[PDB]
Amino acid sequence: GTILIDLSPDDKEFQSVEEEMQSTVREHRDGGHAGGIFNRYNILKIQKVCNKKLWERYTHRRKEVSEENHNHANERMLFHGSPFVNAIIHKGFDERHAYIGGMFGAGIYFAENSSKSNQYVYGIGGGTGCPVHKDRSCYICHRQLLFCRVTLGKSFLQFSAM
Amino acid sequence: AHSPPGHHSVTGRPSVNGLALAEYVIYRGEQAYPEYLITYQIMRPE
Numbered sequence A: 001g002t003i004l005i006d007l008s009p010d011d012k013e014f015q016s017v018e019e020e021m022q023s024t025v026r027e028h029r030d031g032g033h034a035g036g037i038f039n040r041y042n043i044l045k046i047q048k049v050c051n052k053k054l055w056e057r058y059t060h061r062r063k064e065v066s067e068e069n070h071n072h073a074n075e076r077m078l079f080h081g082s083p084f085v086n087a088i089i090h091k092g093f094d095e096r097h098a099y100i101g102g103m104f105g106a107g108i109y110f111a112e113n114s115s116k117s118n119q120y121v122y123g124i125g126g127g128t129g130c131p132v133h134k135d136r137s138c139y140i141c142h143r144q145l146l147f148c149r150v151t152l153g154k155s156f157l158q159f160s161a162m
Numbered sequence B: 001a002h003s004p005p006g007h008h009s010v011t012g013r014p015s016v017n018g019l020a021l022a023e024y025v026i027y028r029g030e031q032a033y034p035e036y037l038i039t040y041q042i043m044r045p046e
């Protein structure tokens, strides 16, 4: 049910999404171990993800959460990076596959810093890096993140020691 | 497995590194929509 619509570089949408990517890079405490050494990205393509079924599922839940939270979905746009991205765009997110305990427990993780999500594209801690060169800092191989619409509702505030 | 009772998500907020932004966790796939697929390379600094 999923179609991917290629956006052109002069589209305002291409440009606002790239700017969110680029501007939310930070330095990481591992010196680039997991995700590599970089200050910015080379954006190769941005596709809009269109699936009627996943969109309706989303807005149905959004409305439920909103009514539970003084008409406030608390909707954000956030990054997700993992090796599950190809499965996710076709099937939607699935909490059953999201069973590994992270810093904040099991579940589906998103980030405000694109560079944080970049740490996970090849696996936990960057896994063994790219499939072709085994290089967590590969500057050749293509990577993929999702920029996602996320309903937070009433979000539990967990301060972390990081 | 589940959001804390009476919550719909978790906000994980760095308290030491003041330059690090938040991370978030949800427990139901229907509470996110993957809107943009971004294909990219990291760039080697000069």
Ligand SMILES: COc1ccc(C2(CNC(=O)c3ccc(NC(=O)c4ccco4)cc3)CCOCC2)cc1
Residues within 6 Å of the ligand: A081, A082, A083, A084, A087, A088, A091, A092, A093, A094, A095, A097, A098, A099, A100, A101, A102, A103, A105, A106, A107, A108, A109, A110, A120, A122, A123, A124
């Ligand atoms: C093998 O590399 C990884 C990379 C990162 C992670 C952590 C975050 N994990 C998720 O954010 C996550 C995992 C799985 C899915 N899976 C799906 O949504 C799905 C739909 C169809 C198939 O899968 C959605 C989200 C696990 C918790 O510590 C932070 C990273 C786990 C495995």
Ligand SMILES: [Zn+2]
Residues within 6 Å of the ligand: A130, A131, A132, A133, A134, A135, A138, A139, A140, A141
């Ligand atoms: Zn490579």
